[PDB]
Structures are given as C-alpha cells and as structure tokens.
Automatic annotation (TrEMBL), chains A, B:
Keyword vocabulary terms for this entry: NADP, Nucleotide-binding, Oxidoreductase
Gene expressing this chain: 17HSDcl
PANTHER family membership: NADPH-DEPENDENT ALDEHYDE REDUCTASE-LIKE PROTEIN, CHLOROPLASTIC-RELATED, RE15974P
Name assigned to this protein: 17beta-hydroxysteroid dehydrogenase
InterPro entries: KR_dom, NAD(P)-bd_dom_sf, Sc_DH/Rdtase_CS, SDR_fam
An annotated Gene Ontology molecular function: nucleotide binding
One Pfam family it belongs to: adh_short_C2
Domain of life: Eukaryota
Species this protein is from: Cochliobolus lunatus
Binding site for NADP(+): 15, 18, 20, 40-42, 66-67, 93-95, 157, 161, 190, 192, 194
Annotated Ketoreductase domain residues: 9-194
Keyword Membrane among UniProt keywords: no
The keyword GTP-binding is assigned to this record: no
Length: 260, 260
C-alpha cells in the first residue's frame, strides 16, 4: 500500500466523459482504481477517458446512463458491480448550469436544473449507499455559489447546490452504518465547457470582455492568480476517497483557490 | 404612522390556516396589514384565522391554492391583488416534513417534499416579485436542520430547506430592482401539528416517551428552557416585513431560542 492510492478499489464517476468528471475519472485510475466512466451523450469523449485509464495501467468501462432517470441510475450501478464485482467509490459529478432573473425562470428550467443537480445527485447517493462495499466513499458536487459566492440571476443553480450541501451532512449519518463517508466538493470557476457558459455572468461587466479576458479576470479572483482546473477538483476528490480522507466526513469543501 | 406597524399594507401567507402560518397571518393583521390567508385543505381553520384578523380590526380573505401547482400559485397571487388592489408582503410558509434513511427514500417521497418545500417556495417567490409593489417584502421558510442541526434520516427535508437558504440570498439580488427585500426564517422545534407528528424522530428512543415528555425534552434544547411557539416565528417575520427590517436582506434567521 502507498499514501493516497486506490489499488484494488473500484470507482464510478457520473458525467466523466468531459470537464471535471473526466479529470476525476482519469485521476482515480492514476491512483490505481478501476473506473466506471458514466456519460449521457459524449460517447467519443467517454471512450477517450476509458483509454487513458487503460494506458496508465488500470481498467475502465464506459456506461451510458441519463442521471435524470432514477431507473437508469439503478441500472448504472448494477452494471458497475456486475462488471467489476464490487464498488467502493462513487463520485457524483453530473450537473448543468443556468442563469436567469427570478422573474423569468420557468417550471421547465427549474425542472431541467434540479432533476440532475439535486434529484439526480440524491439518487446517485442512494444507489451508491446500496451498492458500495463497507468503508467506501461517496462524493457529490456542489458549487462555491451555494454559500460562498453570490451572483445575480443565479438563484436556481445556487439553490440546486445548496440542497446538496445539506444532503451530504445528513447522508454522512445514514451512510455511517456501512462506514461510508460522504462529502461534497464545491468548485469555483473551473475551466471547462460550463466555464464558458457562465464566465460572463461571474465577472462584473462580463458581456463587454472577450472570453480570453474573462478567463484572465477569473484567474485574478484567486489570490494565487490562476484559474481553477479540472485537475484541482480531481486532486481533492482523490484525497477524500482515499484511506487518509476518512476523517473528512459530512463536509462540503469549497475549491476556489481562496477566492472566497 | 407607528414604528413596526403595517397599516395600509397587504400581506399574503401560504399555508396560514394553521401552525406557524396561522400565527404569522394573525400577527401581520395585528400589525395592521390586510391579510390573504392561503390554504390547501384546512378550510375551516383558514376561516377561523380570517375571523380573528377581522375581529382584531383588520381585513382578510381565505384563498385555496395548492402551492405544488405553479399555475395555482399564479392564480393565488392574481386573486390576492384582485381582492385587495395590491400586494406588499409575501410570507412563504407552506411545507411538509419527512423522515427516512437515504436507502429507503423513494422518487415519490423526494417529489412530495421538494415540490412544496423548494419548488413551490421558489415559484411563490417568483409570483411575489412579479405582483409585489415596490418596497415590498418576501420571506421564505427554511429550518434549523438545513445547516445548524444534524438529524439522522432527515436528509431529504434538510436538503429541501438548504436550497431555500441559497435561494433567498440570491433572490435578494434580483428583487433589489423593485426594492423588495428577501429573507428566510429557519425555525427549530416549534410546537405545531408537525411538531407532534415527528418529535419522536428528533429524540433517541423517542417512541418510548410520551408526547408530553418529548415536548419538554425539546424545551430543554433551548438554554431558555421553553419550547418555540408559532408566535415566536410570527414576531420575527413581523419585524422583517416592516419598514425597520429593511437592512436585513438576503439572510436566513435561525429561530431556535439559542439551541444551535
Ligand atoms: N465548471 C465550473 O466552473 C463549475 C463551477 C461550480 C460547480 N460546478 C459543478 O461541477 C460539475 C461538473 O461541471 P463541468 O465543469 O464538468 O461541466 P461541463 O463541462 O458542462 O460537463 C458537465 C458534465 O455533466 C454531464 N451531464 C449532463 N447532463 C447529464 C445527464 N442527464 N446524465 C448524466 N450526465 C450528464 C456531461 O456529460 P454528457 O456530455 O454525457 O452530457 C458532462 O460530463 C457540475 O455538477 C457543476 O454543477 C462546475
Ligand atoms: N414546527 C416546526 O418545528 C418547524 C421546524 C422547522 C421548519 N418548519 C417549517 O415551518 C412551516 C410550517 O410548519 P408547521 O409546523 O406550521 O407545519 P404544519 O402544522 O403541518 O402546518 C403546515 C401548513 O402548510 C400547509 N400546506 C400543506 N400542504 C400544502 C400545499 N400542498 N399547498 C399549500 N399549503 C400546504 C398546511 O395547510 P393545509 O392544512 O390547508 O394543507 C398548513 O397550513 C413549514 O414550511 C415547515 O417546514 C417547522
Ligand atoms: C432532549 O433533546 C431534544 C432535541 C430535539 C428535540 C426535538 C423534538 O421534536 C421536534 C419536532 C420538530 O418538528 C422540529 C424539531 O426541531 C424538533 C426537535 O428539535 C427534542 C428533544
């Protein structure tokens, strides 16, 4: 055994075809875990991630499942265990972002966002608890905008992740009976496809800057003067899911390089 | 004009036929507001509340609306404005509680709880913003279990109110363009019908104590050694919705008499 490694473990990451999830998946593989790479649409990207994990000497499988559909979450987990024999680690990463003034937010947009970000994560947790081996690990994904950062026209998304913060604290109580720790990571601005979607909203007068300028401005929000990257969130998930992270339990870690 | 009074104002309180909502509705009336008393099932109780408000010298109307149905929330607000001419204050109070180990929580139970506690409150807020006169007030209801108090088998409910905490902080940013302040009250154990239903969950071995005993035990959770009552939440809402509460905005006030 080595410090922080996952040799012999099997992990699952929702939405790990791209963005943060892809970096988490590859990293769990680098740490020695076998990985189930879940996607909803990005087949080609999911297979690239699988390949990278095989190339670095571990094993992986890509499995399609729409995390909005609870029956597909059940199946995703059954297929994980059926393929690899057992499951130790579940990272719930899938999410979508949204912007709109309260006055213009519709039923459909609420549902679109909450069905995945909150409901879906909740039942990923539930299936994780049911399928995980004792001593396992569950990590959900929140956001710095849930508590630490207040952005106009961001009420729906901020709320969707605020529920996750509460979930994980209480999940830890229930999941303790199988000695499974439960946490969430709350990234700030992390450079991915979602980053471009939201960067002009997160920055003061964002519409009147270029995408390159916005990224630089978001970099200066951290006192380390750099952007957050998927590897940064990966690094932290990897510690949380390791033996050594056990005493971090029921907590939400904000990962914004000190922006808050 | 007296400091802290609501003379000339019109307030609406969801689920004010009984429990905390009823105490809020009567108290807003006592402060001089005309009150729209919303209910979903408690017709008889809603009319008692209306009567109390008339008897203390103000005016009120009972309006049925299922806060789970966004179209009924729209209609509730239209009927409010149609009856009284305008609307200044909206208190979102309706909610249901739930208990269950993560592993056993179903889709239907998630939906039952979130549709009212989170989704419904969201769209009450939305319709409140659209209908409210400038300088108005919105107050949602969270819970001490959202952040401050951690109870096993309470993940669903705690999350449902954790989203509300986030909502109100961002709602304040959007609602500022009509100078509407937005807050939430997060009660702890407050003696109502919901209290008695579920007090045995909040206490180790609760099933083997009397309802009386359970209430006394909840009393001792506060260092004031008494239970929280509906009037206590009413007292605070009444301050928040007044002129003098304006500078409290985007905040969640935990009302547990110092238990936390
Ligand atoms: N990026 C940021 O700056 C940032 C900041 C705060 C929080 N977050 C949170 O971090 C998480 C990852 O974000 P990201 O930056 O990786 O976003 P991204 O670049 O948009 O990628 C989002 C991921 O979600 C997956 N997904 C979308 N709908 C899905 C569904 N129905 N079922 C299963 N998976 C689905 C996508 O895969 P498909 O292509 O297969 O749909 C994709 O892998 C999200 O939960 C987000 O809320 C991100
Ligand atoms: N008591 C506590 O210790 C406590 C603690 C934390 C938070 N809270 C929160 O405080 C609020 C009220 O608590 P409570 O103790 O008064 O509960 P309660 O005694 O059960 O009262 C609930 C109220 O909500 C209404 N309601 C239920 N379903 C509804 C629907 N579909 N549409 C509209 N209204 C509906 C009920 O009206 P009908 O009878 O007409 O349905 C009733 O007036 C809730 O938001 C709750 O989460 C209470
Ligand atoms: C002696 O310790 C305790 C601690 C907590 C309670 C308690 C009991 O019932 C409740 C019912 C509610 O609806 C909401 C609550 O918030 C509580 C409590 O907080 C009762 C006794």
């Amino acid at each position: 055994y080595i410090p922080g490694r996952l040799d012999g473990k099997v992990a699952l990451v929702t939405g790990s075809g791209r963005g943060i999830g892809a970096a988490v998946a590859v990293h769990l593989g680098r740490l020695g875990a076998k990985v189930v790479v879940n996607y909803a649409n990005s087949t080609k990207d999911a297979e690239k991630v699988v390949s990278e994990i095989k190339a670095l000497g571990s094993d992986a499988i890509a499995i399609k499942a729409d995390i909005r559909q609870v029956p597909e979450i059940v199946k995703l987990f059954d297929q994980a265990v059926a393929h690899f024999g057992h499951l130790d680690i579940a990272v719930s990463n899938s999410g979508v972002v949204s912007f709109g003034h309260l006055k213009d937010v519709t039923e459909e947009e609420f549902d679109r966002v909450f069905s995945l970000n909150t409901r879906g994560q909740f039942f990923v947790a539930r299936e994780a608890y049911r399928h995980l081996t004792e001593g396992g690990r569950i990590v959900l994904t929140s956001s710095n905008t849930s508590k630490d950062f207040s952005v106009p026209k961001h009420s729906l998304y901020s709320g969707s992740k605020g529920a996750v913060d509460s979930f994980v604290r209480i999940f830890s109580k229930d999941c303790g009976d199988k000695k499974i720790t439960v946490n969430a990571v709350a990234p700030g601005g992390t450079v991915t496809d979602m980053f471009h979607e939201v960067s002009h909203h997160y920055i003061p007068n964002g519409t009147s800057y270029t995408a390159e300028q916005r990224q630089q401005m978001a970099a200066h929000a951290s006192p380390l003067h750099r952007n957050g990257w998927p590897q940064d969130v990966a690094n932290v998930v990897g510690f949380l899911v390791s033996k050594e992270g056990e005493w971090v339990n029921g907590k939400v870690l904000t990962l914004d390089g000190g922006a808050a």
